[PDB]
C-alpha cells in the first residue's frame, strides 16, 4: 500500500513540479523580454 501511495504521489508531484518550472520559465522570459524591449526602446 505504501508503494501504491508513493507511486501516485510521485506522479502528482512530478506534474506539479513541471507546471511550476514552466511558470518560472515564463516569468524569467518576461524579465528578458522587458530587458529586450527596453533596449529596442533605446536603439531603434
Amino acid at each position: 500500500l505504501w508503494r501504491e501511495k508513493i507511486n501516485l504521489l510521485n506522479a502528482r508531484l512530478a506534474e506539479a513540479q513541471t507546471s511550476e518550472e514552466q511558470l518560472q520559465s515564463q516569468l524569467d522570459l518576461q524579465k528578458k523580454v522587458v530587458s529586450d524591449h527596453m533596449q529596442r526602446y533605446l536603439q531603434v
Partner: peptide
C-alpha cells in the same frame, strides 16, 4: 553608460 543606459542596466 549614459543616464538612460544606467537606468536600463540598474
Amino acid at each position: 553608460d549614459s543616464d538612460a543606459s544606467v537606468a536600463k542596466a540598474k
